[PDB]
Design a protein around this ligand. Structure first.
Ligand SMILES: [Fe+2]
Ligand SMILES: [Zn+2]
Ligand SMILES: [Zn+2]
Length: 503
């Protein structure tokens, strides 16, 4: 406040500062609108921006009495707000002490832990529990394989999944050693249901302090597909790499084969690649993550390297979506979706070493009973194309009813389908025509996937005519049309081929 200057950047209050897109799960870059919002040292009375105060994003709102770096030595560490309303996200404000218990809050979680064990077990149709990756491959295949993947699998022993994972004993320490101590990761302030920045070192610091945890901290994503060391340490199961649409257009390879497979443009621009297939996840015991459907209706692999998780899940039926949509778009904050989900929500525990494989659309919330380290990834695949498009409808509807903009959605979702259609699907059809082949013979799966995907894209084209292109852009209305035109052309030819067999 006032004319006075900043002890950090020496600037007097100017300022009004408007001085590539996100391809990975990030939500902390939003309240950078506070980085230049002035806090004052209760001691030397010097004013600091915030950024300039030595504070990290996550501690901006924590302190009632602030002591800047130059004062800490003799003043002590800054004094935090008193915990006045443990049952509210704004735990610091007394004006909210009388309001209802909010789903994310400390009070709510503690109580929830006493009653959570009464959430029903899933039916054998919802989840399948196998001993190792060999049994998974056998049962997965016995239900139609990836093209027909509908239930979640829990694999107890990772042997056979062909899934590259660090050896037990691997922990947070190794993570910070590899990524660096100054690597900033999006962290969820569980009790405040909000996401902030935090040095990876700071997190480790807080994580290791076991007896004193005023707040709980889990990190959002931490996607490591671009860290040359990490990216080889934990990988998706082979079967996931073999069906991942992103992996099909931006193939992993990145070795000697990379030089060659891009020597034919079989590798799209790296900045266009969705960055969501390899994430590391650490969480404190007592943590809770509220019900969500994974972005783009992406499938998930989820390996527990350390600790235990309890997942609360609900099958992706239309009613369950409708119910979920209402819950997401409602202002109510005190009701647990499970309690109003007409009995759909089930309970499943995942222990250390165990793995979770989740198909498209499953609604799920997560309880973290024990300090945890997890490795996982999100992927799209043709076997779940319909469900993926259904979730995308759901998301797009939810996005119109409440102004999220902080909510993360699948990066380049549409671009990816244009590319996939043009590079992969169109060629199969084009070629199958060049030989007068009836795709139903040996490629029914591919034929059906093309019609479904095309219909969805036809809807995107028309939307783009009536309303104009999207902000997300990246592919030019013209190119989009040329693609569509060519696709219609080939699908017609293949249709006539199929119809000729009529007599
Ligand atoms: Fe999730
Ligand atoms: Zn400053
Ligand atoms: Zn000071």
């Amino acid at each position: 406040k006032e004319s006075d200057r900043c002890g950090g950047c020496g600037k007097f209050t100017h300022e009004d500062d408007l001085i590539k897109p996100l391809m990975s799960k990030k939500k902390s870059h939003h309240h950078k609108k506070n980085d230049f919002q002035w806090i004052g040292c209760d001691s030397c009375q010097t004013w600091y921006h915030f950024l300039c105060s030595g504070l990290e994003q996550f501690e901006y709102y924590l302190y009632e009495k602030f002591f800047c770096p130059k004062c800490v030595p003799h003043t002590g560490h800054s004094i935090r707000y008193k915990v006045v309303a443990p049952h509210r996200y704004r735990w610091y404000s007394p004006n909210e002490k009388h309001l209802g218990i909010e789903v994310g809050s400390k009070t709510w979680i503690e109580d929830f832990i006493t009653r959570e064990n009464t959430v029903p077990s899933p039916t054998d149709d919802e989840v399948c529990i196998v001993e190792d990756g060999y049994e998974f491959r056998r049962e997965f295949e016995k239900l139609g394989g990836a093209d027909n993947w509908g239930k979640v699998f829990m694999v107890k022993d990772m042997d056979g999944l062909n899934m590259t994972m660090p050896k037990p004993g691997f922990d947070l320490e190794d993570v910070v050693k590899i990524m660096g101590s100054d690597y900033e990761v999006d962290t969820i302030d569980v009790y405040n249901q909000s996401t902030y920045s935090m040095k990876l070192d700071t997190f480790r610091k807080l994580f290791r302090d076991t007896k004193n945890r005023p707040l709980l901290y889990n990190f959002l994503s931490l996607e490591f597909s671009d860290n040359n060391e990490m990216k080889e340490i934990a990988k998706p199961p082979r079967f996931v790499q073999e069906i991942s649409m992103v992996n099909r257009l931006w193939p992993d390879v990145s070795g000697a084969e990379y030089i060659k497979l891009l020597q034919r443009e079989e590798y799209l621009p790296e900045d266009q690649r969705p960055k969501v297939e390899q994430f590391c996840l650490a969480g404190m015991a007592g943590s809770y993550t509220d019900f969500h459907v994974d972005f783009g209706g992406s499938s998930v692999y989820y390996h527990i390297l350390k600790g235990e998780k309890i997942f609360y899940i609900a099958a992706p039926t239309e009613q369950n979506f409708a119910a979920y949509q209402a819950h997401e778009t409602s202002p109510d904050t005190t009701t647990w979706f499970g309690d109003i989900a007409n009995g759909a929500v089930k309970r499943v525990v995942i222990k250390e070493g165990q793995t979770l494989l989740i198909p498209a659309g499953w609604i799920h919330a997560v309880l973290t009973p024990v300090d945890s380290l997890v490795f996982g990834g999100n992927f799209l695949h043709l076997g779940n194309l319909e469900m993926q498009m259904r979730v995308y409808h759901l998301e797009n509807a939810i996005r119109k009813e409440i102004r999220s903009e902080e909510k993360f959605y699948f990066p380049n979702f549409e671009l990816l389908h244009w590319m996939y259609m043009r590079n992969v699907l169109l060629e199969k059809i084009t070629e199958a025509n060049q030989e007068g082949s009836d795709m139903r013979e040996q490629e029914k799966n591919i034929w059906t996937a093309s019609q479904i995907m095309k219909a969805e894209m036809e809807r995107w084209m028309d939307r783009e005519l009536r309303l104009g292109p999207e902000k997300n852009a990246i592919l030019p209305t013209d190119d989009k049309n040329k693609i569509m035109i060519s696709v219609r052309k080939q699908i017609e030819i293949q249709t006539k081929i199929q119809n000729a067999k009529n007599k």
